[PDB]
Scaffold this active site. Structure first.
Site, short mmCIF file in Angstrom:
data_model
loop_
_atom_site.label_atom_id
_atom_site.label_comp_id
_atom_site.label_asym_id
_atom_site.label_seq_id
_atom_site.Cartn_x
_atom_site.Cartn_y
_atom_site.Cartn_z
CG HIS A 226 -1.99 0.77 1.20
ND1 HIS A 226 -1.82 2.49 1.35
CD2 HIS A 226 -3.48 0.83 0.73
CE1 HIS A 226 -3.00 3.08 1.04
NE2 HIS A 226 -3.96 2.04 0.80
NE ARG A 269 -6.38 -0.98 -0.45
CZ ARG A 269 -6.96 -1.92 0.42
NH1 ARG A 269 -6.94 -3.15 0.25
NH2 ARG A 269 -8.06 -1.36 0.81
CE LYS A 272 -9.80 -0.43 -2.32
NZ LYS A 272 -10.21 -0.27 -0.90
CG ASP A 275 -7.34 9.41 -2.08
OD1 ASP A 275 -7.58 10.66 -2.25
OD2 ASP A 275 -7.91 8.58 -1.37
CB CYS A 277 -4.58 11.55 0.14
SG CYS A 277 -4.89 9.84 0.26
CE1 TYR A 278 -4.82 6.05 -2.12
CE2 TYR A 278 -3.42 6.19 -0.55
CZ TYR A 278 -4.38 5.96 -0.84
OH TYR A 278 -5.11 5.05 -0.13
CG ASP A 330 -10.94 10.35 -2.51
OD1 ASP A 330 -10.01 9.93 -3.52
OD2 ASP A 330 -11.72 9.36 -2.07
CG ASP A 337 -10.41 15.73 3.93
OD1 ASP A 337 -9.22 15.70 3.95
OD2 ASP A 337 -11.17 14.94 3.25
CG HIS A 340 -8.12 14.34 0.54
ND1 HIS A 340 -8.90 13.90 1.62
CD2 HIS A 340 -7.81 13.15 0.07
CE1 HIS A 340 -9.06 12.59 1.66
NE2 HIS A 340 -8.32 12.19 0.54
C1 PB9 Z 1 -3.65 8.77 16.76
O1 PB9 Z 1 -4.08 8.60 15.44
C2 PB9 Z 1 -3.81 9.46 14.65
O2 PB9 Z 1 -4.02 10.51 14.91
N1 PB9 Z 1 -3.88 9.21 13.36
C3 PB9 Z 1 -3.51 10.23 12.06
C4 PB9 Z 1 -4.62 10.00 10.98
C5 PB9 Z 1 -4.48 8.60 10.59
C6 PB9 Z 1 -5.73 7.79 9.63
N2 PB9 Z 1 -5.98 8.48 8.35
C7 PB9 Z 1 -7.05 9.35 7.95
C8 PB9 Z 1 -6.69 10.79 7.83
C9 PB9 Z 1 -8.03 11.51 7.43
C10 PB9 Z 1 -8.17 12.87 7.89
C11 PB9 Z 1 -9.15 13.71 7.15
C12 PB9 Z 1 -9.05 15.15 7.56
N3 PB9 Z 1 -9.18 16.41 7.83
C13 PB9 Z 1 -9.94 13.44 6.45
C14 PB9 Z 1 -10.00 12.04 6.02
C15 PB9 Z 1 -8.90 10.93 6.44
N4 PB9 Z 1 -8.88 9.69 6.10
C16 PB9 Z 1 -9.96 9.00 5.44
C17 PB9 Z 1 -9.46 8.92 4.02
C18 PB9 Z 1 -8.34 9.54 3.04
N5 PB9 Z 1 -8.09 9.12 1.83
C19 PB9 Z 1 -9.10 8.15 1.66
N6 PB9 Z 1 -9.99 8.05 2.84
C20 PB9 Z 1 -11.27 7.21 3.03
C21 PB9 Z 1 -7.72 8.77 6.77
S1 PB9 Z 1 -4.27 7.97 7.23
O3 PB9 Z 1 -3.71 9.51 6.70
O4 PB9 Z 1 -3.45 7.18 8.11
C22 PB9 Z 1 -5.07 7.01 5.79
C23 PB9 Z 1 -5.84 5.91 6.06
C24 PB9 Z 1 -6.46 5.27 4.97
C25 PB9 Z 1 -6.62 6.00 3.80
C26 PB9 Z 1 -5.59 6.84 3.62
N7 PB9 Z 1 -4.94 7.48 4.55
C27 PB9 Z 1 -4.84 7.37 11.82
C28 PB9 Z 1 -3.90 7.72 12.97
C1 FPP Z 2 2.53 8.86 9.18
C2 FPP Z 2 1.18 8.17 8.70
C3 FPP Z 2 -0.03 8.06 9.69
C4 FPP Z 2 1.08 7.89 7.18
C5 FPP Z 2 -0.20 7.32 6.89
C6 FPP Z 2 0.00 6.39 5.76
C7 FPP Z 2 -1.30 5.71 5.04
C8 FPP Z 2 -2.02 6.84 4.06
C9 FPP Z 2 -1.63 4.65 5.19
C10 FPP Z 2 -2.99 4.16 4.96
C11 FPP Z 2 -3.40 2.68 5.46
C12 FPP Z 2 -4.71 2.22 5.04
C13 FPP Z 2 -5.53 1.46 6.17
C14 FPP Z 2 -5.11 2.58 3.65
C15 FPP Z 2 -6.55 1.77 3.28
O1 FPP Z 2 -7.56 2.74 3.32
P1 FPP Z 2 -8.81 2.78 2.26
O2 FPP Z 2 -8.92 1.04 1.96
O3 FPP Z 2 -9.82 3.11 2.62
O4 FPP Z 2 -8.03 3.18 1.14
P2 FPP Z 2 -7.75 2.54 -0.49
O5 FPP Z 2 -8.94 2.04 -0.90
O6 FPP Z 2 -7.14 3.89 -1.33
O7 FPP Z 2 -6.63 1.45 -0.06
ZN ZN Z 3 -7.44 10.21 0.46
#
Ligand code: PB9
Ligand code: FPP
Ligand code: ZN
EC number: 2.5.1.58
Lengths: 401, 315
Positions: A226, A269, A272, A275, A277-278, A330, A337, A340
């Site tokens: 990922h 990945r 899928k 997005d 953010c990638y 996204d 948000d 992003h």
């Molecule tokens: C103590 O924990 C923390 O503080 N953490 C910091 C944030 C973290 C979760 N994360 C989230 C951060 C996040 C913040 C906002 C706002 N404003 C909106 C959406 C979102 N998503 C949702 C999203 C983003 N792109 C697609 N989706 C659905 C994932 S992530 O960056 O790790 C991640 C996860 C899955 C997919 C992509 N990126 C968890 C740990």
């Molecule tokens: C330092 C730090 C906290 C970095 C974060 C790195 C990061 C973005 C990890 C994502 C892990 C994860 C559960 C993705 C799948 O979510 P999803 O299945 O909803 O998204 P997808 O369909 O695009 O894989």
């Molecule tokens: Zn995203």
């Protein structure tokens, strides 16, 4: 514009007449992206790729002060909100009023745990993720006051309490383990100069075990590759100077394959959806790889561009990821948000600025006012902020305990 | 007596009699707040009280019920989850009832880290994985690619040695969606941890199966990546017939994935003193430009790197 060229329709998905949830959802996204791309043609206007700076600014500067209850879901990630916002402003070349900076420093002080590390908010237990965000935020501010907030001795103590025998790190006491924690630790430990001889013993090896058959890196050994975890993995290895521990070529082929031929953006990945953010997590891997391969004296590396379609990425971000009202997102149809906004912008900067040794080369799609301040591929904060912070903390000795 | 946070007759904690003895503790955001969340009153109310019971470390049944509301308001609050686990052991709560609770909360928020970690801790405490494969299967039936679900599944399988039926489960999901990369990953996870890929019969089986899937869905990248992934170890040039058999789909199933795979085979042939080095190189370089200029332009910089890299190495 690459995305609007006639031969580009030729990149639409080919399902071989075998539909599955995967092809169906990809097709839906492409259909919607195509509508965006064609919007100019059907309205009879000349395409104008403009980064809505002012809009993004009002959105950011207001969010830095207060947020609606829609953010109650991020009440345990406030240092992240600080970082995402301050970094987006930094990229947009917007200044941080000394009064705001001091307010951020003071808030983060409240988030800091007496045992080291930062929590998701005042009084919350420390966690490596908000710890990483707090330190990055403080470094963006870069004032003596910011630097002084961080209790270095306790931070080192905290990292040790999370260190595992196999080389990994827990995200927090009694918490889980995954590649992100290694990156969070290596990032804060290096910026604040608290790395001891054995702090990261076995970490490079543990991260390498997370690289799988795909070429990318999974959260823990055995998991699917990922973009988020791959960025964290490689970036942590670059900090530790152990990038050789990975098969860099299978990794390079994996990440370049993650860019969508049609949308221009990156998916997280294989198979899928794209997005915004990638644009950072995935695309940010190219600069890291360029540096690593260059270190091994690779002679075939380009001297002007990263190994991904810089133009296509900028086009996806500029046409599809901006919210008219300000902020980024996204994909078309999703809500804006701060997360992003931060990473779409980070990825745009990366896509705009190339650099390797003495070679520098920019690619700015749309109006020239679209150019953003550069960002460091390892820490994702301004390169200047990295040097200033590291230079500062090197003045202090590594805590001895 | 759980008064659901969504119940029509839910009442704020400050209006509850059994909570009249304690003073709620407001959150200290400082005199000049930043990223200040304008919480709804229900949220403020629950967290002001959670903070009260947390600061005094009150390990009571009421604090326990309260963490449930704080969790529902923000499932990602790990501090709350930590306190709930503390209360589960102090109060000696029935962990099976807690399993029913976590099952329900995960069903509602399957993409939250905390809920899955909590479940794992409960499974560890009980040392009972009897419900896991089935529960996870239900989550995957709703989102076949849920990362946490797959990670929990691998943890359960490897921790309690539950390998016996996973390959069958993989086949099932591949039939449903042959493009599910999470499943191709699971396939490699099961095989490499059981028989391994050194078994010639096993490798034969796997390559044949994958080639068949490729024929059915030529543009499915997952199948291609799995084929490359299981052969790259020993080296593509180690399998002479493969090149020819792929060279036949040149007209029928000729996607940019096949072209790329051909270049990959060439790359390895040159690295292992192959016959006709002068010839193989030109073909490879030919494909690299076809890919860069026509078939896979989004990746032009990569293919130019490869051709240009292939030259400096095998000129
Ligand atoms: C103590 O924990 C923390 O503080 N953490 C910091 C944030 C973290 C979760 N994360 C989230 C951060 C996040 C913040 C906002 C706002 N404003 C909106 C959406 C979102 N998503 C949702 C999203 C983003 N792109 C697609 N989706 C659905 C994932 S992530 O960056 O790790 C991640 C996860 C899955 C997919 C992509 N990126 C968890 C740990
Ligand atoms: C330092 C730090 C906290 C970095 C974060 C790195 C990061 C973005 C990890 C994502 C892990 C994860 C559960 C993705 C799948 O979510 P999803 O299945 O909803 O998204 P997808 O369909 O695009 O894989
Ligand atoms: Zn995203």
């Amino acid at each position: 514009l690459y995305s609007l060229r006639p031969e580009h329709a030729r990149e639409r998905l080919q399902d071989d007449s075998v539909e599955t949830v995967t092809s169906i959802e990809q097709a839906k996204v492409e259909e919607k992206i195509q509508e965006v791309f064609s919007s100019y043609k059907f309205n009879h206007l000349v395409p104008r790729l403009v980064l809505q700076r002012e809009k993004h600014f009002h959105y950011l500067k207001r969010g830095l002060r207060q947020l609606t209850d829609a953010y109650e879901c991020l009440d345990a990630s406030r240092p992240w909100l600080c970082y995402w916002i301050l970094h987006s402003l930094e990229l947009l070349d917007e200044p941080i009023p000394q009064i705001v900076a001091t307010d951020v420093c003071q808030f983060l002080e409240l988030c800091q745990s007496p045992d080291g590390g930062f929590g998701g908010g005042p009084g919350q237990y420390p966690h490596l993720a908000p710890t990483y965000a707090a330190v990055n935020a403080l470094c963006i501010i870069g004032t003596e006051e910011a630097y002084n907030v961080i209790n270095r001795e306790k931070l080192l103590q905290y990292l040790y309490s999370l260190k595992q025998p196999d080389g990994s790190f827990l995200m927090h006491v009694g918490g889980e383990v995954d590649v992100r924690s290694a990156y969070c630790a290596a990032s804060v430990a290096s910026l604040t100069n608290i790395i001891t001889p054995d702090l990261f013993e076995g970490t490079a090896e543990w991260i390498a075990r997370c690289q799988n058959w795909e070429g990318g890196i999974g959260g823990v050994p055995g998991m699917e590759a990922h973009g988020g975890y791959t960025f964290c993995g490689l970036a942590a290895l670059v900090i530790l100077k152990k990038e050789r521990s990975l098969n860099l070529k299978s990794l390079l082929q994996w990440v370049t394959s993650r860019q969508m031929r049609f949308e221009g953006g990156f998916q997280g990945r294989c198979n899928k959806l794209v997005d915004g953010c990638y644009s950072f997590w995935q695309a940010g891997l190219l600069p890291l790889l360029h540096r690593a391969l260059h270190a091994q004296g690779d002679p075939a590396l380009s001297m002007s561009h990263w190994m991904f379609h810089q133009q296509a990425l900028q086009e996806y971000i500029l046409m599809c990821c901006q919210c008219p009202a300000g902020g980024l997102l996204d994909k078309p149809g999703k809500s804006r948000d701060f997360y992003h906004t931060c990473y779409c912008l980070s990825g745009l900067s990366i896509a705009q600025h190339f650099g390797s040794g003495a070679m520098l080369h920019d690619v700015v799609m749309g109006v020239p006012e679209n150019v953003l301040q550069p960002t460091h591929p390892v820490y994702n904060i301004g390169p200047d902020k990295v040097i200033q912070a590291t230079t500062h903390f090197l003045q202090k000795p590594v805590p001895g305990f | 007596g759980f008064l659901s946070l969504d119940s029509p007759t839910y009442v704020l904690y400050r209006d509850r009699a059994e909570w009249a003895d304690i003073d709620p503790v407001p959150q200290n955001d400082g005199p000049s707040p930043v990223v200040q969340i304008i919480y709804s009153e229900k949220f403020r109310d629950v967290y002001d009280y959670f903070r009260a019971v947390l600061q005094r470390d009150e390990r009571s049944e009421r604090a326990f019920k309260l963490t449930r509301d704080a969790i529902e308001l923000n499932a990602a609050n790990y501090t709350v989850w930590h306190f709930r686990r503390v209360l589960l052991r102090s109060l000696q709560k029935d962990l099976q009832e807690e399993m029913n609770y976590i099952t329900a909360i995960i069903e509602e928020q399957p993409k939250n880290y905390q809920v899955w970690h909590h479940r794992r801790v409960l499974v560890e405490w009980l040392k009972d994985p009897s419900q896991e494969l089935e529960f996870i299967a239900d989550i995957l039936n709703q989102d076949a690619k849920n990362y946490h679900a797959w990670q929990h599944r691998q943890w359960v399988i490897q921790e309690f040695r539950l390998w016996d039926n996973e390959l069958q489960y993989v086949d099932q999901l591949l039939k449903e969606d042959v493009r599910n990369n999470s499943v191709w990953n699971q396939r490699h996870f099961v095989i490499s941890n059981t028989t391994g890929y050194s078994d010639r019969a096993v490798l034969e089986r796997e390559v044949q199966y994958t080639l068949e899937m490729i024929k059915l869905v030529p543009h499915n990248e997952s199948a291609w990546n799995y084929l490359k992934g299981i052969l790259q170890d020993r080296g593509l040039s180690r399998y002479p017939n493969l090149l020819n058999q792929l060279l036949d789909l040149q007209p029928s199933h000729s996607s940019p994935y096949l072209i790329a795979f051909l270049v990959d085979i060439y790359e390895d042939m040159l690295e292992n003193q192959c016959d006709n080095k002068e010839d193989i190189l030109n073909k490879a370089l030919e494909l690299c430009e076809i890919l860069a200029k026509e078939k896979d332009t989004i990746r032009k910089e990569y293919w130019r790197y490869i051709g240009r890299s292939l030259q400096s190495k095998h000129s």
